[PDB]
Design a protein around this ligand. Structure first.
Ligand SMILES: [K+]
Ligand SMILES: [Zn+2]
Ligand SMILES: [Zn+2]
Ligand SMILES: [Zn+2]
Ligand SMILES: [Zn+2]
Ligand SMILES: [Zn+2]
Lengths: 183, 385, 576, 353
């Protein structure tokens, strides 16, 4: 049984979100400023600048692309709370009306990536993967967590949407509430 | 600041004379919210009945306002909301299981019949009244059919669908600079307070009940944002208030506003669910304690509109509105009811009076002093007109 | 301290800590040198403030409000909106008018449609056969409201068949008009006769419930006088005044608060009334025997005569004159032997402290008492308070009942409940107060069942005289308390010293200390002591509590009198 | 016409004998109107023209009720939004709708040899993602559901517990009154708001003494022969200092949404307005938390998450005494210096004149 030991501050950030999309009824403002792709490209670029071994950087880029594609394919299935699903559907409608097939990675913020990571242990232990492969995955995502916690106040700052602007979250109207929750 | 002053009887002001206008459509009494509903359009008939048996038709001119059309109603609501109202009927409700949940029109305020027609009549009445005032043939317009102040911009909450008070205030604002909206229904008039929260040309002042009671809004600290800071006066009262305490709170706040805001047109929402014995309300007011406030507003002599409102027991509200109209026409009405078609409801005494109960008064004077102190301290800054 | 919180915000948050201590808080203020602020509205982002909103001109844009929104689920914390109580009789009064609305709604819709149908028939009669051949009736029937006639038709005509007949009406007017018109008339007739014949019973019922359903603080009152009148509550109120006075005494800027309880006794006939009530009660009561009956009457009579210093013979004349319109020292009754005999017969500082203070022509008097004397006096002053409240509303209620203009249009139709006039309970334009008293006499005697008393007090006193619903169960209480003063020997002897003291015409502080000590001798350190201090000039009665080490009299105002009481307290070697 | 109405019987029928027994003891002037009303169209805008497996009643993705589409091939049913992509109810799937799992099974034809074959195929194609391969294959085979935090992270905090429907509830919520609605219909009028009955609410239960009001220091109990001098003492839920509803000016009994907090709890947020954010952590309860005593007690600043004693940084009363004196005296010094520079610029501009 594998275990992933997230730093405490990111657990607090996750619980803070878990309240925000629950009984305060806010949602994630989209398209956010720092999507998933910018995060991971910055991570990989910064880590390849210091790493000298070839296989290290090969496994680095493999991890990057793999996390990317799996987020891309799983976001719709199991990363969204109940209240958000309506915004998701509306985004699909807009994309299909504009004839651009939807990519989750170029709209959604990093908080969903933290949601993914927080899930990841169950995702892996529900499978038949190799012990060494799952172990290297845990070590890898752990290094990603470390690099993320070094910059935690660049993405996850608080701004109180009800007063100034451009906070990471926004409020919903009563019609959006009614449709999304009480369809 | 509040100081206990007893109940002085209401009397007609001698000099203030004015040529009023009574709007009544002969059909609105037929509608009826299906089965057991606290507000119903039968009590719009009973009122008129009495005014036609007391013979006030010689004292003022009664019209019927040509109804509002979709474009005119959509000065406030969104196209989709107005349209969905104009389309829905209980046969094809199932076709609308997305909108009927978005717009809240299926649960507390059901769809019954003539819905669009009823709402259109109330809206057209309100607008034509503001217009005749605006143009100036009269100096008052009573519209006892309108007054749906909970209906928000894109959802009908609280048994009321079309928010005609907002349309009336807009048509008023077409000519008059500043308009003052005085609400004395027991609930909080969140529709109008919201729809003029970010402006300085309309000042809303609502005396409502606070606590776990519909609609849970209307604290004392909601005092308007944007350019409209300090231009909204919510007064949260407590249960069981009597006529004396209500008058002693009402009079100074309204005098202070009209000293400092200086409105050019008043819109008074004369609801009847603040009366003793209602299914919904929890106050303990009489007929005199409720006519006193309208008498006070009239005293100043500003072009004004009186609008209807709640009403959960047709006997109290019918007699109250007959009395209020009589008072507006500088006539104190005889306390014995003549013979009319609905003579049977008014038992057992068959009189024009409403009786208070012995419910326990809770509004402690120190509470009132603190509230009126906060409100005066805020209003200190509306001195510039 | 870390420049995290503002200055003025800190000042406000400290005010809630030093607010009642004005000196400390102003010292702190001068020492330191001194958006959604409403919790109900959110803000929508400026990406949802763009909707169709067809007919808005320029002005309706700058004046309306689109972003700032609020709704009764974020204010209600997702769970709220409690409702009122609405006691049973009130919903029983609701159902009646609900049925009324149903009937009148159907009748009036039938009328409003039948009249238009009839005028359309009037239009079609004078036409020719060719014109009725091509006549069609437009939707609306030429009227303004389009949906009510379809509603009445579908109610009467089996909604599927309702649609059938409504379309066959719009397209075949000349063949469908008379039959549907006649049937509507017939249904209107049947509905109308049933409506009036049910309207009889509706009134018959709401008459027996209306006032009983408008006056219900008075039924939270059959129990809030049997449970909130025990001695526990009675001592709790006054001990609370005492404790709060003490804990505010530490607030030194607050002056010395007043004594615990104050009372005024303006109207004197009510004592005569109370003695007559007690006499009638015991006269009916079969739990005591005749000697005990006479003992009870005697105790009430003579204690009321003395404590209020009311001349006995004037009391006797007033009481017998009361008994006309319906057709011995206190110690002598105090001791059983006396009662039975009379009934069968038919340095320099101490000396100056003791010399000053002998008041001449005593006008302010005292009573000291342990608990049961307080409870007796408490029941007495309560019952007086209630009866006085009524006899103050008396004149206005008489003027009200004298001007009740019965509308004979109703009384010929017997629309008014003659029940209370059938038994004659109603209050004639004479003194309503006398009628209330006589009715209470009858209730104690039982000549009227209780419900009639309650309904009489509701209708005659429209809503304001409910407290008398217990006028029986209170007097039985009071009388019973009186009996204790005869039996518990301790209380009898305390009352004995009361007779002595109140009988004394000149006394100093020293004899008062003697009275206190001799009374506290009868009850141990477990019992409490309260002074019922009487003022005959003003007729004011002030009850003070006593912590068992406290003084006899209220604290003096001057230092010389304080030294005087101290030295006269040391003059008797009792613990000061 | 024989169908019963609100009255109990058909409309064309008088009262029965049971009702009339248990309910008994033993020209007009609005004829007019079509003569006085004359229409008003004086308004400004009159120019405007104007195998039988039984399905579920739950969204097995979110385990809450609603209007849901059911499956033709498994008993599992979802709300119309809980799908990927979510399906519009206006344009329903023409014909039978098959869930992800049954569509998966019929795509694999119940043959695991093809399963392992296509797994080898997939891992052959994208060797670029050779690591995540199993999951990338399996994602399309699991039925959707809302995202629940893994319990191993709900446990890090003790004061974070889920509500009824899987919602955040941080113990500042009062409680599920439930049966209190039966209590709300009290046989004797003693409803929740506590009107006309405050004898024993002014008196502590266990101790037995009086509940004092911190701001006016009097349990005003009145007298229940004279009740117009009660003042509705209520007690907080955290600190329990009893307050008057007239000192904290609010006028209601907070009884349904949350627990009431006195004005004696310091912040839980900042809004610096010159506008920075929080100064308080969460409750990083259990053994895991590390308490740290400072080595320096006069100018250590470190946080606003202090803990007072006789990473949470403990401190002593006298230390904060010193630090507040430091704030006060530095503030008076800088205020004096601001006045000094103000007056000195004034004197410079005067002597220039
Ligand atoms: K405003
Ligand atoms: Zn209302
Ligand atoms: Zn669902
Ligand atoms: Zn399936
Ligand atoms: Zn207080
Ligand atoms: Zn507290």
């Amino acid at each position: 049984k594998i275990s992933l030991q997230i730093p405490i501050k990111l657990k607090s950030v996750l619980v803070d979100d878990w309240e925000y999309v629950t009984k305060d009824k806010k949602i994630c403002r989209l398209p956010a400023d720092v999507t998933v792709e910018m995060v991971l490209n910055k991570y990989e670029h910064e880590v390849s600048q210091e790493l000298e071994s070839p296989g290290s950087q090969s496994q680095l880029s493999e991890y990057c692309a793999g996390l990317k594609l799996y987020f891309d394919k799983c976001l719709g299935n199991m990363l969204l709370y109940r209240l958000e699903r309506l915004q998701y559907d509306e985004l699909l409608k807009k994309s299909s009306k504009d004839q651009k097939p939807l990519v989750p990675i170029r709209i959604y913020g990093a908080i969903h990536l933290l949601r993914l990571i927080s899930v990841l242990p169950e995702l892996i232990s529900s499978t038949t993967m190799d012990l060494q492969s799952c172990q290297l995955l845990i070590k890898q995502t752990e290094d990603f967590l470390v690099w993320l916690l070094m910059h935690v106040d660049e993405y996850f700052n608080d701004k109180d949407p009800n007063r100034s602007d451009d906070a990471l979250y926004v409020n919903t109207s009563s019609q959006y509430e009614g449709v999304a929750l009480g369809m | 600041v509040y100081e206990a002053t007893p109940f002085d009887p209401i009397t007609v002001k001698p000099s203030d004379k004015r040529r009023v206008a009574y709007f009544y459509d002969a059909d609105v009494g037929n509608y009826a919210y299906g089965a057991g509903h606290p507000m119903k359009p039968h009590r719009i008939r009973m009122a008129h009945s009495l005014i036609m048996n007391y013979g006030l038709y010689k004292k003022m001119e009664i019209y019927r306002a040509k109804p509002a059309t979709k474009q005119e109603m959509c000065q406030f609501h969104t196209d989709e909301y107005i349209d969905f109202l104009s389309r829905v009927t209980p046969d094809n409700l199932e076709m609308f299981k997305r909108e009927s949940v978005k717009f809240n029109v299926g649960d507390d305020c059901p769809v019954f019949d003539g819905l669009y027609e009823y709402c259109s009549i109330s809206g057209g009445g309100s607008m034509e009244g503001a217009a005749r005032l605006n143009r100036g043939k009269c100096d008052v317009a009573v519209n006892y059919a309108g007054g749906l102040h909970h209906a928000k911009k894109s959802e009908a909450s609280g048994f009321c669908y079309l928010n005609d008070i907002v349309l009336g205030i807009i048509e008023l604002l077409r000519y008059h600079p500043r308009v003052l909206y005085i609400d004395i229904d027991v609930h909080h008039g969140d529709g109008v307070e919201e729809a003029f929260y970010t402006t300085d040309r309309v000042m809303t002042c609502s005396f409502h009940k606070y606590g776990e009671f519909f609609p849970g809004t209307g604290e004392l600290r909601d005092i308007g944002v944007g350019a409209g800071k300090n231009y909204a006066v919510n007064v949260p009262l407590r249960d069981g208030i009597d006529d004396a305490t209500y008058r002693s709170v009402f009079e100074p706040v309204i005098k202070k506003i009209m000293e400092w805001y200086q409105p050019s047109a008043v819109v008074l929402q004369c609801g009847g669910d603040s009366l003793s014995g209602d299914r919904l309300g929890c106050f303990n007011l009489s007929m005199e304690g409720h006519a006193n406030c309208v008498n006070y507003v009239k005293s100043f002599g500003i072009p004004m509109m009186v609008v209807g409102g709640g009403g959960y027991t047709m006997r109290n509200v019918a007699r109250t509105w007959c009395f209020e109209t009589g008072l507006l026409n500088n006539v104190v009405l005889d306390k014995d009811l003549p013979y009319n078609e609905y003579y049977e409801y008014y038992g057992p005494d068959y009189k024009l009076s409403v009786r208070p109960s012995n419910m326990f008064n809770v509004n402690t004077p120190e509470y009132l002093d603190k509230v009126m102190t906060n409100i005066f301290a805020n209003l200190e800054n509306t001195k510039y007109a | 301290s870390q420049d995290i919180l503002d200055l003025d915000d800190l000042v406000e948050k400290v005010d809630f800590y030093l607010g009642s201590n004005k000196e400390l808080f102003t010292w702190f203020k001068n020492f330191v040198g001194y958006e959604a602020f409403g919790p109900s509205y959110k803000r929508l982002p400026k990406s949802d403030t763009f909707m169709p909103c067809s007919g808005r001109d320029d002005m309706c844009w700058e004046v309306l409000n689109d972003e700032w929104v609020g709704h009764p689920v974020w204010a209600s914390e997702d769970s709220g909106f409690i409702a009122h109580r609405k006691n049973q009789y009130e919903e029983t009064l609701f159902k009646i008018e609900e049925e009324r609305h149903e009937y009148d709604f159907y009748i009036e819709s039938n009328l409003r449609t039948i009249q238009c149908l009839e005028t359309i028939v009037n239009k079609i009669e004078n036409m020719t056969e060719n014109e009725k051949a091509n006549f069609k009736l437009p939707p609306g029937l030429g009227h303004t409201s389009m949906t009510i006639y379809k509603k009445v038709i579908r109610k009467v005509y089996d909604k599927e068949r309702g649609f059938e007949i409504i379309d066959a009406l719009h397209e075949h007017p000349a063949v469908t008009a008379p039959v549907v018109l006649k049937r509507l008339k017939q249904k209107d007739e049947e509905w109308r006769r049933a409506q009036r014949e049910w309207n009889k019973v509706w009134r018959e019922l709401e008459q027996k419930v209306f006032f009983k359903s408008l006056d219900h603080l008075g039924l939270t009152f059959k129990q809030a006088d049997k449970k909130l009148l025990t001695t526990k509550q009675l001592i709790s109120e006054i001990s609370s005044i005492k404790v709060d006075q003490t804990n505010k005494k530490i607030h030194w800027l607050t002056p010395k608060p007043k004594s615990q309880l104050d009372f005024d006794f303006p109207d004197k006939n009510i004592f005569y009334d109370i003695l007559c009530l007690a006499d009638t009660f015991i006269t009916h009561t079969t739990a005591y025997s005749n000697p005990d009956k006479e003992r009870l009457k005697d105790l009430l009579k003579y204690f009321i005569s003395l404590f209020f210093s009311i001349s006995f013979e004037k009391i006797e004349e007033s009481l017998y004159s009361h008994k006309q319109n319906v057709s011995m020292s206190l110690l002598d009754i105090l001791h059983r032997s006396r009662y039975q005999k009379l009934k069968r017969s038919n340095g320099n500082l101490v000396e100056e402290a003791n010399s000053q203070g002998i008041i001449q022509n005593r006008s302010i008097f005292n009573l000291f008492a342990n608990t049961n004397i307080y409870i007796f006096f408490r029941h007495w002053t309560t019952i007086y308070e209630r009866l006085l409240e009524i006899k103050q509303m008396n004149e206005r209620v008489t003027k009200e009942i004298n001007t009740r203009s019965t509308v004979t249009f109703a009384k010929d139709l017997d629309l008014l409940s003659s029940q209370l006039s059938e038994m004659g309970l109603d209050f004639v334009g004479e003194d309503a107060y006398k009628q209330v008293l006589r009715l209470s006499r009858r209730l104690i005697n039982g000549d009227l069942e209780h419900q009639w008393f309650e309904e009489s007090l509701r209708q005659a006193y429209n809503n304001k005289a409910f407290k008398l619903y217990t006028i029986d169960k209170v007097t039985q209480s009071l009388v019973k308390h009186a009996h204790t003063l005869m039996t518990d020997a301790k209380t009898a002897e305390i009352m004995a010293l009361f007779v002595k003291d109140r009988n004394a015409s000149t006394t100093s502080a020293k004899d008062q200390i003697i009275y206190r000590l001799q009374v506290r001798s009868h009850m141990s350190n477990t019992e409490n002591m309260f002074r019922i201090e009487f003022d005959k000039r003003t007729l004011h009665v002030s009850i003070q509590y006593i912590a068992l080490d406290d003084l006899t009299l209220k604290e003096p105002k001057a230092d010389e009198d304080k030294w005087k009481y101290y030295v006269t307290s040391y003059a008797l070697p009792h613990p000061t | 016409d024989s169908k019963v109405s609100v009255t109990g019987l058909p409309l064309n029928k008088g009262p029965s004998e049971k009702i009339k027994r248990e309910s008994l003891w033993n020209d007009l002037k609005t004829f007019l109107t079509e003569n006085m009303t004359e229409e008003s169209n004086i308004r400004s805008t009159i120019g405007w023209n104007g195998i039988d497996f039984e399905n579920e009643d739950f969204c097995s993705a979110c385990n809450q009720s609603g209007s849901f589409l059911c499956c033709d091939t498994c008993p599992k049913s979802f709300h119309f939004l809980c799908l990927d992509p979510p399906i519009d109810p206006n344009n329903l799937p023409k014909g039978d709708w098959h869930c992800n799992e049954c569509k998966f099974k019929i795509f694999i034809n119940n043959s695991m040899a093809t399963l392992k074959k296509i797994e080898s195929n997939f891992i052959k194609q994208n060797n670029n993602v050779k690591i995540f391969a199993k999951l990338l294959f399996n994602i399309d085979s699991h039925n959707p559901k809302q995202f629940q935090l893994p319990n191993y992270i709900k446990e890090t905090f003790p004061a974070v517990k889920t509500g009824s429907r899987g919602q955040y509830s941080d113990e500042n919520d009062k409680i599920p009154l439930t049966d209190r609605q039966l209590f709300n219909t009290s046989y004797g009028q003693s409803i929740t708001k506590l009107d006309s009955y405050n004898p024993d609410t002014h008196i502590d239960s266990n101790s037995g003494k009086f509940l004092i009001c911190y701001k006016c220091n009097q349990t005003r109990l009145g007298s229940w022969s004279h009740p117009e001098n009660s003042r509705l003492i209520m007690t907080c839920d955290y600190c329990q200092t009893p307050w008057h509803l007239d000192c904290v000016p609010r006028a209601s009994f907070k009884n349904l949404g949350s627990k009431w907090k006195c004005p004696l709890h310091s912040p839980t947020k900042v809004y610096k307005k010159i506008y920075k954010v929080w100064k308080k952590q969460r409750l990083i309860n259990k053994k895991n938390q590390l308490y740290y005593e400072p080595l320096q007690k006069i100018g250590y600043q470190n946080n606003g998450n202090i803990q007072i004693i006789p990473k949470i940084t403990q401190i002593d009363e006298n230390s904060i005494k010193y630090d507040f004196f430091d704030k006060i005296y530095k503030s008076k010094m800088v205020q004096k210096r601001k006045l000094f520079q103000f007056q000195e610029s004034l004197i410079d501009k005067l002597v220039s004149n």
